[PDB]
Design a protein around this ligand. Structure first.
Ligand SMILES: CCCCCCCCCCCCCCCCCC(=O)OC[C@H](COP(=O)([O-])OCC(O)COP(=O)([O-])OC[C@@H](COC(=O)CCCCCCCCCCCCCCCCC)OC(=O)CCCCCCCCCCCCCCCCC)OC(=O)CCCCCCCCCCCCCCCCC
Ligand SMILES: CCCCCCCCCCCCCCCCCC(=O)OC[C@H](COP(=O)([O-])OCC(O)COP(=O)([O-])OC[C@@H](COC(=O)CCCCCCCCCCCCCCCCC)OC(=O)CCCCCCCCCCCCCCCCC)OC(=O)CCCCCCCCCCCCCCCCC
Ligand SMILES: CCCCCCCCCCCCCCCCCC(=O)OC[C@H](COP(=O)([O-])OCC(O)COP(=O)([O-])OC[C@@H](COC(=O)CCCCCCCCCCCCCCCCC)OC(=O)CCCCCCCCCCCCCCCCC)OC(=O)CCCCCCCCCCCCCCCCC
Ligand SMILES: CCCCCCCCCCCCCCCCCC(=O)O[C@@H](COC(=O)CCCCCCCCCCCCCCC)COP(=O)(O)OC[C@H](O)CO
Ligand SMILES: CCCCCCCCCCCCCCCCCCCC(=O)O[C@H](COC(=O)CCCCCCCCCCCCCC)COP(=O)(O)OCCN
Ligand SMILES: CCCCCCCCCCCCCCCCCCCC(=O)O[C@H](COC(=O)CCCCCCCCCCCCCC)COP(=O)(O)OCCN
Ligand SMILES: CCCCCCCCCCCCCCCCCCCC(=O)O[C@H](COC(=O)CCCCCCCCCCCCCC)COP(=O)(O)OCCN
Ligand SMILES: CCCCCCCCCCCCCCCCCCCC(=O)O[C@H](COC(=O)CCCCCCCCCCCCCC)COP(=O)(O)OCCN
Ligand SMILES: CCCCCCCCCCCCCCCCCC(=O)OC[C@H](COP(=O)(O)O)OC(=O)CCCCCCCCCCCCCCCCC
Ligand SMILES: CCCCCCCCCCCC(=O)SCCNC(=O)CCNC(=O)[C@H](O)C(C)(C)COP(=O)(O)O
Lengths: 64, 157, 58, 108, 546, 55, 125, 117, 88
């Protein structure tokens, strides 16, 4: 306590309850994080879908 | 540190009055931190008064059925009835005491002698016949002059 | 009523008990005026006191 | 101010000596009771698990949810690898009899 | 002479950190560090004249093979070609003056030789990075400068904010390092080799350029990765000069110029957004080192756009890198001298007059500031005007918006650099400590970098200097007018009453605060779920009470 | 259990492990009704697991 | 000046919170959160709602011009065609998807070169 | 609005803290000290126009409005002297505390320096 | 130099007496050590706030607010400054 009159004392305490985040906030932020940090997975899934729909068009208009 | 008193055994002495099953009052001296069953053994009580603590990993501890007055009910140590120690006490009440049970019934190894026990009067409760193995049993009658203290070992086997 | 195996299973449906004891808080420095600001636009930005003591003196 | 060595080596234990010997336990920490309590509680935190609302919901959406996401990604990668290698549809566990294990004597 | 540019700063670091330094002390270690940098600079000068001017590249097999399993073959091999010679000349020349400065700046530090050894290690790993001929020895240099940046940013370890700044630099760069590693996997898989001369890509699979761009955006501190760069001011002033001039931030731009496998839309958009963002960020700061840090981020945006423009744009990007290192290191060294003359204060509201600094410190700040704002016929004028004119004739419509962003950024830069000079010297005194530094070593350290600024005007970086891209006089002389507008506005010292815009920009758009809870707190909470609910909960198997 | 098993068997037209799992879920939910709550989920899981182990 | 005074941080003298490892106590006063701005008052007393509200306008204010020029403006805005090359030099230069010579609308294979500069992501089989 | 510390102050010290923080925030928002001097004079004249008040409701309204203004205009980058908390020179190279030394620990009780089993 | 990090009493006294005399209402002859700011000198609370901020400027200090509330006289200021290791 020899420096409390120079740099401040220990009377003011931290205002935080150390509690977990709310469930909806955690879910929404995790879904945004999955979308941002795993964007090659969505890009490649979209590539597979766009490729298979073209083969569907070919197989549809070919056998007619 | 200064001229304060040298430690004596009399500072740590605890005196308990014990009434055996014949009604004879006895003066029992013990030390602080020693259990009650140990002080009863070292006083010279017969071996028919004692029985194994029926828990796992503690059958080498001898124990006795004592009656404790209502003032000293809160100085018996606490046992969780859901834990394994609680099931040990339940086995002892189920098998050894049976219908000698009263509301003052405890077990002497669960009493750790301190200054709060100084002047407490207890009585030895009766027990039913029991057997652990061929070398440690009780037929049901307290007719034997052999002390528990004179046994060199407590044998689980 | 009927005695079953459900009486013997220690189900994990008991909430943990907390205490009213005051928990530890680390000391932090003092912030004298710490009201959280949520408004992008505020009338306090164009307050006459602000105009008198910040903008107007030469 | 202890003396644990003779002038020619020869460690001395100092069992009956007045001065406190420096030894293995000289720098052992002085235990803070609340720190010991908090570490004990975190060591036995499985006693604090309870099936309330938040526990059930987070165990469904994160644990089961990401496990299902990883299983779907693994199957996707397996099928795409088999397509980009010239293989037909291949038999994973519970998938009806099909091709497993390509032959080295075969051109795909 | 060729291996002396790479080995020998690493040797200086090894000497000054080992128990050899217990016999030399501070006094002997300063001599060892300065000599070990002078030799490497002389070697780099010889390499520069041989390779850049006479066009004879040199390839050295140094330590045999590193590891070779299957068709993945990494060798301990260097190659010294035009880009490598450019980078080696720049890095060793800047690091020599920074060592000469640091031997006097950190004189009163208790662990001076440890600091000098860390500086030498950082320089040597940068030399290893640019001298490598394949991707894996480049990754040695990449992670080596990352580690040495961690050691040097958090040098004053008893201060918690410095430790957290060093950890932040490590983590932000670790994200981009992961993406760069995945891109290296793509490149090797679809081309068959790791050496640069066998990596000629016309049309690749998109993930290649994107992931290598993300890995470069980490080190060059572009948008959504710039957050570590401002907090890296916790380290001492020589660390900041070497981080912002020659090492670390120029590594991603070097990698993109070397590989040339990007897709230009992402590169142009990222670079121009970064330039405008760092321009408005540095206009609203009062910490003297943070303004210079944001100007570094802005110029890296300029170089990013230029390498987006094309091969000529890649050459202009390397040219602006080379000329930027000299005046940026000079700016940081002059700012360190001004800080030491004012009792350690870094706030520009507590400066003024011409008593707290030497005449040479004020001259250094003036000349490097004039080169940065594109004053005509100084060093930065040639490279910055080349990038601006190349952006004015690109046929991509995206480059139309990028050019406008660059012109606005140029006006902002001439505003806040003139503000840095104005607050430091022209206004009345408002500090209370006047201890001006006039030692020989930091003055000579500044004079060397000013000589390099003159050298870039006299001898160009490449052949683009003097080439005329044909633009009207209105398009050509507009950046001069934007420089004059910034100068006039900053000397008028005018301000606006729109305080909510001022506090949105001065708080740097809230990127750190939004990152404190969009990935960070969720990572902590998901860890709580996986431990408590999973390991202690759902997967835990209890005991059978009996 | 037996009626739900054979009903799902005849409804789906084929013999597989789904009928046993559905019959186990139904029987365990019948056992677990009216009890506190790990149990209305835990008992369908136990009876379905017995069916799966049987198969 | 080495050896300056610094205030020490007190040890815990009360029961600890369950998730106490979100405070960084290094020994000196003051400690900090494990990540800055995760809790406690933000600088300038701003909040997350402040930044998200200002960004919900400012983000489209920055993304607006790029969209406009990428969808409503093309190669013909330029007063000149790209740099001209002999056929043997040009034919390798425009193989790069990166090249700015694909914006040569006077080339005889302008469309085919633009159709070959479409970015793909998964390499097909 | 004021923090929970300032709301606990006596009225005289509450007004004093409000004037002091106003002067410091005017330092933080100014370019120089010579810019700050007439703003300090204007802030002083602003407090002098409410000195002779007696109605506690009007006093409370003025006090609360000024505290809202000070919470609004809290600078995001305050000017702190470097060797104090929040400064740039705080906690850099402190003197080491006394650490204890054990001489020749390996030579004490040799052959028995492992872990028990 | 002198002192284990603390300035001497006499020079601190001289500097505080120099800072205190910068008011129009102050008579210079009444300015002495152990003189009260309000009762003896005749300064209000705002004048005391300005005086403590000026002493912060004079000795290069960031005085904490609870400590600045306690300063009420010349001797209090002198005793506070002589207990600062950071006072220059
Ligand atoms: C596995 C280990 C245990 C599972 C965890 C469940 C638990 O203990 O939660 C306690 C916890 C009790 O919370 P509480 O603090 O007491 O207060 C919440 C209620 O107010 C208190 O209400 P309650 O739960 O005590 O009883 C009333 C309950 C009414 O619920 C019930 O009576 C029982 C719930 C479902 C019936 C079970 C049928 C079959 C499920 C087993 C599947 C076996 C697979 C076979 C193949 O009404 C509600 O709460 C409304 C929500 C019910 C939604 C039911 C949807 C399930 C169908 C799935 C559709 C897809 O439950 C919740 O968190 C609420 C949701 C209700 C139950 C969970 C429903 C979904 C989760 C099932 C996952 C299992 C699948 C595994 C594969
Ligand atoms: C950069 C620094 C960042 C923070 C400062 C915010 C500056 C924003 C602003 O509009 O300030 C104008 C601001 C005028 O604001 P003000 O003086 O407080 O308000 C005008 C008067 O009340 C009364 O003035 P007045 O009515 O006589 O007319 C002045 C004003 C028009 O004033 C009005 O009446 C506003 C009506 C709006 C449409 C006209 O004129 C204009 O602003 C027209 C365009 C030039 O100009 C200055 O006096 C400050 C000059 C400092 C450099 C700013 C020069 C423009 C820089 C262009 C790049 C923008 C970078 C920021 C990106 C945004 C994120
Ligand atoms: C027959 C089992 C004998 C072998 C295991 C043994 O000796 O367990 C003794 C021991 C008995 O402990 P207890 O003190 O009576 O407490 C019972 C549970 O904690 C009961 O606590 P609870 O209320 O949390 O139980 C509900 C239980 C839901 O119970 C089930 O999921 C039962 C379905 C099992 C059938 C297989 C499919 O949910 C879970 O505990 C998590 C989902 C299990 C997956 O059982 C456990 O430690 C739990 C068994 C859970 C099995 C899954 C383990 C996951 C890895
Ligand atoms: C081949 C390389 C071999 C080694 C070369 C490097 C050794 C030269 C630098 C010597 C250590 C620098 C520190 C030093 O000498 O400090 C003095 C600075 O010495 C100088 O004058 C500057 C160093 C020499 C000039 C710079 C040499 C560096 C090499 C680069 C030259 C580029 C041009 C301090 O001042 P002083 O001793 O002159 O004055 C004493 C004081 O006033 C009273 O206490
Ligand atoms: C050995 C030691 C480790 C064992 C770990 C547990 C293994 C559990 C599963 C064993 C095999 C189950 C049968 C697999 C095949 C099968 O019939 O089920 C498939 C799905 O099962 C699946 O394969 C999906 C479930 C399995 C997911 C991963 C394992 C979960 C357990 C561990 C998670 C730990 C997380 C920690 C929080 C059917 O496919 P479908 O019908 O769904 O397809 C839709 C199209 N028909
Ligand atoms: C805690 C982290 C510390 C970081 C340390 C710095 C960073 C290091 C990063 C890279 C480390 C690589 C070290 C490799 C060690 C030797 C590996 C090669 C072994 C070997 O037998 O190779 C021969 C040895 O030659 C030779 O070694 C040359 C012969 C002797 C002449 C030069 C003497 C060396 C002077 C170096 C000065 C200080 C430099 C400090 C790095 C060369 O022949 P080969 O079989 O490979 O044939 C091919 C070309 N002929
Ligand atoms: C007073 C404020 C006026 C602002 C404009 C700057 C001064 C320009 C004066 C002027 O009218 O010049 C015109 C420039 O316009 C143009 O054709 C160029 C427009 C863009 C110029 C911006 C940079 C100005 C240089 C700084 C005519 O140009 P001229 O007929 O004199 O030009 C050929 C001779 N060199
Ligand atoms: C699934 C994969 C998820 C990928 C992203 C995960 C990021 C996890 C970060 C964990 C941080 C734990 C350690 C920690 O808090 O250290 C801080 C680092 O802050 C930080 O790391 C803050 C910056 C976080 C940015 C992360 C993304 C950057 C690229 C954007 C795309 C200290 O540093 P501090 O924040 O207290 O700094 C103070 C200087 N003033
Ligand atoms: C670890 C986490 C790592 C992942 C991080 C983030 C990745 C996000 C990925 C999001 C998309 C994943 C891919 C899904 C779209 C592609 C689709 O491929 O086809 C699926 C895949 C491919 O179909 P096919 O290619 O046509 O054969 O479909 C399947 O065969 C799987 C369908 C069922 C998947 C869920 C099964 C239930 C598992 C429950 C696990 C929970 C246990 C809890 C125990 C505690
Ligand atoms: C960026 C700018 C933000 C603006 C900051 C806020 C500016 C608003 C200032 C105007 C609001 C007020 O006056 S707040 C109201 C202040 N007025 C009163 O309290 C009535 C007087 N009562 C007294 O007890 C004393 O005179 C007392 C003056 C307290 C002490 O002085 P002394 O002990 O000597 O006597």
């Amino acid at each position: 306590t020899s420096l409390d009159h120079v740099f401040g004392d220990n009377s003011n305490k931290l205002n935080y309850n150390f509690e977990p985040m709310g469930m909806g906030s955690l879910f929404i932020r995790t879904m945004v994080m999955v979308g941002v940090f795993f964007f090659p997975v969505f890009i490649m899934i979209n590539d597979d879908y766009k490729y298979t729909s073209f083969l569907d068009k070919v197989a549809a208009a070919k056998a007619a | 540190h200064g001229p304060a008193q040298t430690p004596t055994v009399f500072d740590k002495l605890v005196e308990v009055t014990v009434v055996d099953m014949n009604g004879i009052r006895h003066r029992v001296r013990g030390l602080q931190g020693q259990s009650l069953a140990q002080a009863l053994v070292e006083y010279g009580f017969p071996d028919t008064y004692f029985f194994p603590n029926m828990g796992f990993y503690t059958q080498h501890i001898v124990d006795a059925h004592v009656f404790v007055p209502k003032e000293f009910w809160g100085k018996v140590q606490n046992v969780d009835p859901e834990s394994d120690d609680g099931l040990a006490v339940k086995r002892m009440f189920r098998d050894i005491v049976q219908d000698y049970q009263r509301d003052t019934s405890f077990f002497a190894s669960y009493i750790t002698l301190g200054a709060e026990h100084n002047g407490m009067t207890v009585g030895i409760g009766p027990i039913k016949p029991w057997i652990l193995h061929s070398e440690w049993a009780f037929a049901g009658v307290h007719d034997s002059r052999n002390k528990q203290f004179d046994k060199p070992t407590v044998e689980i086997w | 009523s009927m005695k079953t195996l459900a009486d013997y299973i220690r189900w994990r449906n008991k909430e943990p008990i907390k205490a009213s004891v005051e928990e530890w808080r680390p000391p932090v420095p003092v912030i004298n005026y710490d009201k959280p600001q949520n408004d992008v636009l505020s009338a306090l930005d164009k307050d006459p006191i602000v105009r008198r003591v910040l903008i107007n003196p030469k | 101010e202890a003396k644990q060595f003779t002038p020619d080596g020869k460690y001395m234990p100092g069992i009956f000596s007045k001065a406190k010997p420096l030894d293995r336990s000289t720098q052992w920490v002085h235990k803070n009771p609340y720190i010991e309590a908090w570490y004990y509680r975190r060591d036995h935190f499985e006693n604090e698990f309870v099936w309330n609302y938040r526990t059930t919901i987070e165990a469904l959406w994160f644990l089961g949810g990401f496990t299902a996401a990883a299983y779907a990604l693994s199957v996707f990668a397996f099928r795409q690898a088999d397509r980009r290698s010239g293989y037909p549809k291949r038999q994973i566990l519970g998938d009806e009899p099909a091709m497993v294990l390509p032959d080295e004597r075969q051109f795909y | 002479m060729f291996l002396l540019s790479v080995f020998f700063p690493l040797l200086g670091g090894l000497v000054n950190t080992s128990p050899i330094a217990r016999f030399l002390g501070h006094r002997g270690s300063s001599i060892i560090a300065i000599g070990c940098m002078v030799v490497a600079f002389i070697s780099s000068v010889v390499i520069y004249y041989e390779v850049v001017f006479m066009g004879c590249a040199v390839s050295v097999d140094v330590f045999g093979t590193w590891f070779s399993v299957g068709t993945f073959h990494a060798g301990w091999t260097f190659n010294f070609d035009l880009l490598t010679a450019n980078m080696l000349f720049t890095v060793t020349g800047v690091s020599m003056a920074v060592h000469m400065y640091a031997c006097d700046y950190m004189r009163q530090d208790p662990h001076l030789n440890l600091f000098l050894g860390y500086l030498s290690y950082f320089t040597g790993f940068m030399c290893v990075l640019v001298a490598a001929d394949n991707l894996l020895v480049m990754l040695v240099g990449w992670e080596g400068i990352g580690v040495c940046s961690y050691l040097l940013i958090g040098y004053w370890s008893h201060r918690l904010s410095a430790v957290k700044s060093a950890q932040k630099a490590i983590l932000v760069n670790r994200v981009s390092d992961g993406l760069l590693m995945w891109g290296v996997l793509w490149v090797w898989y679809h081309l068959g080799s790791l050496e640069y001369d066998l990596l000629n890509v016309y049309s690749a699979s998109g993930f290649v350029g994107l992931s290598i761009l993300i890995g470069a955006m980490g080190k060059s501190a572009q948008i959504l990765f710039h957050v570590w760069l401002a907090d890296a001011m916790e380290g001492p002033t020589p660390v900041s000069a070497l981080i912002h001039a020659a090492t670390l931030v120029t590594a991603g731009v070097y990698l993109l110029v070397r590989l040339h496998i990007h897709d230009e839309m992402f590169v142009i958009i990222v670079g121009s957004l970064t330039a405008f963002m760092a321009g408005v960020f540095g206009a609203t700061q009062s910490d003297l080192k943070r303004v210079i840090a944001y100007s570094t981020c802005s110029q890296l945006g300029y170089m990013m756009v230029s390498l987006g423009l094309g091969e000529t744009g890649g050459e202009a990007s390397m040219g602006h890198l080379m000329t930027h290192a000299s005046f940026k290191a000079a700016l940081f060294l002059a700012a360190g001298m001004v800080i030491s003359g004012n009792g350690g204060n870094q706030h520009i509201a507590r400066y003024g007059g011409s008593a707290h600094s030497a005449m040479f410190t004020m001259l250094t700040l003036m000349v490097a500031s004039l080169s940065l704002i594109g004053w005509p016929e100084l060093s930065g004028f040639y490279s910055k005007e080349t990038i601006l004119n190349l952006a004015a004739i690109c046929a991509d419509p995206i480059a139309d918006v990028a050019h406008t962003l660059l012109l606005l950024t140029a006006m902002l830069t001439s505003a806040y650099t003139t503000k840095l000079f104005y607050q430091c010297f022209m206004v009345d005194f408002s500090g209370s400590s006047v201890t001006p530094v006039r030692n020989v070593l930091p003055i000579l350290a500044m004079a060397i970098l000013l000589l390099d600024i003159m050298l870039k005007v006299w001898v160009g970086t490449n052949l683009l200097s003097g080439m005329l891209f044909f633009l009207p006089w209105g398009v050509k002389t507009l950046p001069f007018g934007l420089m004059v507008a910034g100068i006039l506005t900053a000397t008028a010292a005018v301000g606006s009453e729109r305080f909510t815009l001022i506090r949105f920009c001065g708080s740097r758009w809230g990127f750190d605060q939004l990152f404190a809870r969009s990935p960070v707190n969720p990572i902590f909470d998901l860890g709580r779920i996986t431990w408590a609910i999973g390991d202690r909960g759902l997967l835990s198997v209890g005991n059978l009470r009996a | 259990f037996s009626f739900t098993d054979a009903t799902v068997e005849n409804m789906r037209g084929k013999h597989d492990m789904t009928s046993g799992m559905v019959a186990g879920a139904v029987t365990g939910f019948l056992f677990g009704m009216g009890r506190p709550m790990p149990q209305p989920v835990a008992w369908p899981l136990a009876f379905a697991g017995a069916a799966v182990a049987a198969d | 000046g080495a050896g300056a005074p610094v205030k020490l941080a007190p040890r815990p003298d009360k029961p600890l919170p369950t998730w106490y490892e979100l405070w960084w106590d290094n020994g000196y006063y003051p400690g900090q959160p494990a990540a800055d701005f995760m809790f406690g008052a933000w600088p300038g007393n701003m909040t997350e709602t402040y930044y998200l509200r200002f960004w919900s306008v400012f983000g489209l204010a920055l993304a607006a011009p790029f969209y406009y020029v990428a969808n409503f403006t093309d190669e013909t805005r330029m007063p000149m065609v790209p740099q001209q090359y002999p056929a043997e030099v040009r034919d390798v230069l425009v193989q790069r998807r990166n090249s700015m010579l694909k914006h040569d609308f006077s080339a005889p294979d302008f469309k085919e070169v633009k159709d070959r500069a479409k970015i793909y992501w998964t390499p097909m089989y | 609005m004021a923090s929970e510390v300032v709301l606990a102050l006596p009225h005289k010290l509450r007004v004093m803290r409000m004037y002091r923080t106003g002067l410091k925030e005017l330092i933080n928002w100014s370019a120089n000290r010579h810019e700050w001097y007439p703003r300090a004079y204007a802030l002083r004249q602003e407090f002098e126009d409410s000195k002779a008040l007696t109605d506690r409701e009007e006093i409370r309204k003025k006090l609360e409005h000024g505290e809202e203004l000070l919470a609004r205009f809290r600078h995001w980058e305050p000017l702190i002297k470097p060797e104090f908390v929040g400064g740039t020179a705080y906690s850099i190279n402190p003197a080491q505390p006394k650490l204890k030394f054990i001489p020749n620990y390996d030579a004490m009780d040799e052959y028995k320096k492992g872990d028990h089993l | 130099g002198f002192g284990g990090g603390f300035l001497d009493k006499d020079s601190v006294t001289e500097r505080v007496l120099h800072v205190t005399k910068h008011f129009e209402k102050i008579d210079a002859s009444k300015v002495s050590p152990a003189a009260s700011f309000e009762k003896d000198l005749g300064l209000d609370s705002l004048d005391v706030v300005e005086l403590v901020m000026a002493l912060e400027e004079e000795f290069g200090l960031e005085i904490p607010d609870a400590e600045a509330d306690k300063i009420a006289s010349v001797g209090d200021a002198i005793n506070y400054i002589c207990s600062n290791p950071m006072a220059k």
